[PDB]
Design a protein around this nucleic acid. Structure first.
Ligand SMILES: [Mg+2]
Lengths: 77, 50, 100, 63
RNA sequence: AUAUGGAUUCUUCACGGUAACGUAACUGAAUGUGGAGACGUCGGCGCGAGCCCUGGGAGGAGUUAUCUUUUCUUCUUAACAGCUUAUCACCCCGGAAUUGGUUUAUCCGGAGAUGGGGUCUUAUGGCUGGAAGAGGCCAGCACCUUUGCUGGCUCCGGUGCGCUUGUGACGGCCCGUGAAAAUCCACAGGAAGGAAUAGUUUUCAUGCCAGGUCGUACUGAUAACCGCAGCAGGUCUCCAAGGUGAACAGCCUCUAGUUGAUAGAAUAAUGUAGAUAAGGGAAGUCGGCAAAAUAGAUCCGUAACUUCGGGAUAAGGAUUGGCUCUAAGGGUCGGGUACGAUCAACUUAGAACUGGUACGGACAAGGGGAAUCUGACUGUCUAAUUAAAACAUAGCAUUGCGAUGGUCAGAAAGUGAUGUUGACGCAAU
RNA sequence: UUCAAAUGAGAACUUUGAAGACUGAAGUGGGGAAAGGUUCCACGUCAACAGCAGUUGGACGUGGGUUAGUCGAUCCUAAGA
RNA sequence: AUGGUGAACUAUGCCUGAAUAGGGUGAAGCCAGAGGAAACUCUGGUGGAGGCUCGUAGCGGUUCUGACGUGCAAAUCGAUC
């Protein structure tokens, strides 16, 4: 139920020792009428809040998929 | 009413247990005279006044 | 301003069974498409091209799929093709005729 | 047969009133077995319980 | 209960802004002060929300002898969180008459107006997270089948004296001025505890555990309640679509819900309810009882009398449809430091034409006048035979009493009402 | 109110479909308070009750059903006791 | 006569809630204008007062001395109000 903008905090927050699950969601959005893009949301399940980091760049989004720790239970849908 | 005290619902449970006809085998007893349930009560005929 | 929309009608299915005439259907659209409320006022604003399996409408003036359904349903009732042909949209502006 | 329960569930399942639910008269025997909401959902899917068309109130004369 | 990160200190317990004030925190015991809780009603005005109306577009359904780019229908976004958003209020500059600013409503300015620049409440609104993965609307492919699967679209606007509801700033009104506490916070105050190889804050963030007991179905009423009953009675309240129309009128329709009240056949008298009648027009009757007539709106015109406020819609006349037009009534953008374009409301007035002189065409809807008796008025009562000239009422007048009192209550009392009162009062007429 | 089908020994009255209507949003709609107490729902069923009927029912027989830290009570106080 | 029970109806006070279309009329306050020997008078707006008024819901219960009067009802029903 919260938003975070910096990628630096997401990588710190995903190793918070209370995080057990996280989801990756794919959304087909429309920025301009000339071309659609792919908007992916990275969500992490904290004990009290759900942090959603929204990434619009497809290339930067791919770099964040393997950046997550292996102990994290990542859901893709 | 919907919202009710425990006294009322407890006393309704008593009146719901008692609402059914006579057991069949009792009239088969030796020297039996009870022919039916004379204290049967229905919600449409007489009110409990509780 | 001058953007053109393309509406395609897939009449392939009912033409083999012999109950539909694709050539006449394009002819019917030309006379009855109203452009600012007039028949025959299609002064190159719209264009109906028929090639035997698909009928395409390219329009720069006012036009909508709900109009094209209205005209097509007008034709099938006129020729007693109703309860035999349905005007269906497979996807956006990709309408198709179903025989079933 | 008695299909008031079947009509009551169909109204609640399809989200419309009982005055709209249509029960197939020629398929009465099958509808009588639909004792749950899951069964009514099966019957709605295969056309045995069609919802209905709505009654129109046109504003053409008002416009 | 509790640790880490963060915050702070050798200038021991924060900084920045002239200021209104701001921030992620940023020691504060006893004690005291302040606020919230915490409050009427009506009137009109601004804003929001839902609904209503409506345009384009993407789907589905209906009509199609003829016409209809057509009629109906889906296009949704919760609690909570972050950022921003405010009428009012306030701060700094500056110093005002040729007074200015300004509201629908006339109030404010040398106790600092106009103006320029800022601060704040977050009702409310917008964007984003939630959240499209949900819901809605369609298309295609299989099946005894427990059944499904796969695809799309779910978008962008406009308007308003509209309806309902919330809210704001004001105004009117009062011999009426329209609760209490639990609880929550803040401030003043300086007890105590503290720093250097180290301390302190749990009003900052994150992290841990628990949240007992009783209620919860259903009706809520021409069948679940009360009326001896499945009774034409009674019983507090919330939401409220379109048209006509001033109207949560009357009439028709949409959503939703009913199609329940013993039926059948004939159409005598007499009934109950609804109606119409030539000529006359109250002669009927205790008595115009009953019925009829008038009736909406616009224009014209309106007496006696009067406490000057009324009477008054007095009385009395005209008009009223349809269609084709005409005129006026607005917003927002366009100029070196008069006008033009675009967009959008129904409102009024006028003119031709047209018809079996019709037109508030159904519904809806005052009969009027001249007088006498009586009650001043509004209000109240004999539930189930009397609604009145009765009672009340204001106003007027009188009477008792200064508290060891007046009036009244109590078996009595270290008892009570007025009395949380004090003659501009309380009591009795 | 009507036509037809289903069920049944039996249908004016039950169910389903169709048609014709009404309530017309200060409703014959959707929720509650007081009151009732199981009337709610399913199955079986018509001796009695529904002032005709009855296969139906708020009837009869047998059972099922009410899940809270957040909605209430629980706390405060008012007139009062 | 003695001792009890009732304000679930109703009467009055107090406490806390809740409800009440659409019209007509047009009070104070305010603005502008006109006539003016001054003094002052007049006109048009604005505004939205009243135990005002037409009239819904509501509350009531005037007349038909209507229906009914072994009723739907131990007080109801319709119209009028
Ligand atoms: Mg002079």
């Amino acid at each position: 139920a919260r938003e975070i903008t910096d990628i630096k905090q997401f990588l710190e927050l995903t190793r918070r020792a209370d995080v057990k699950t996280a989801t990756v969601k794919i959304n087909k959005k429309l920025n301009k009428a000339g071309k659609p893009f792919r908007q992916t949301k990275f969500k992490v399940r904290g004990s009290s809040s759900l942090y959603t980091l929204v990434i619009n760049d497809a290339g930067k989004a791919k770099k964040l998929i393997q950046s997550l720790p292996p102990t994290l239970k990542v859901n893709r849908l | 009413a919907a919202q009710k005290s425990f006294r009322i619902k407890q006393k309704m449970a008593k009146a719901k247990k008692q609402n059914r006809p006579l057991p069949q085998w009792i009239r088969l007893r030796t020297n039996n005279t009870i022919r039916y349930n004379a204290k049967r009560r229905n919600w449409r005929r007489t009110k409990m006044n509780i | 301003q001058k953007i053109a929309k393309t509406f395609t009608v897939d009449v392939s299915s009912p033409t083999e069974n012999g109950v539909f005439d694709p050539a006449s259907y394009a002819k019917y659209l030309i006379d009855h498409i109203k452009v600012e409320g007039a028949v025959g006022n299609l002064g190159n604003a719209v264009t109906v091209t028929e090639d035997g399996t698909v009928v395409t409408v390219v329009s720069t003036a006012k036009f909508s799929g709900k109009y094209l359904k209205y005209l097509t349903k007008k034709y099938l009732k006129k020729n007693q093709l109703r309860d035999w042909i349905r005007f269906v949209s497979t996807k956006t502006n990709e309408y198709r005729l179903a025989f079933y | 047969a008695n299909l008031r329960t079947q009509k009551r569930l169909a109204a609640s399942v399809v989200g419309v009133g009982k005055r709209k639910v249509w029960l197939d008269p020629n398929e009465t025997s099958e509808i009588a077995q639909a004792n749950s909401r899951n069964a009514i959902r099966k019957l709605v899917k295969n056309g045995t319980i069609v919802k209905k068309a709505v009654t129109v109130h046109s504003k053409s004369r008002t416009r």
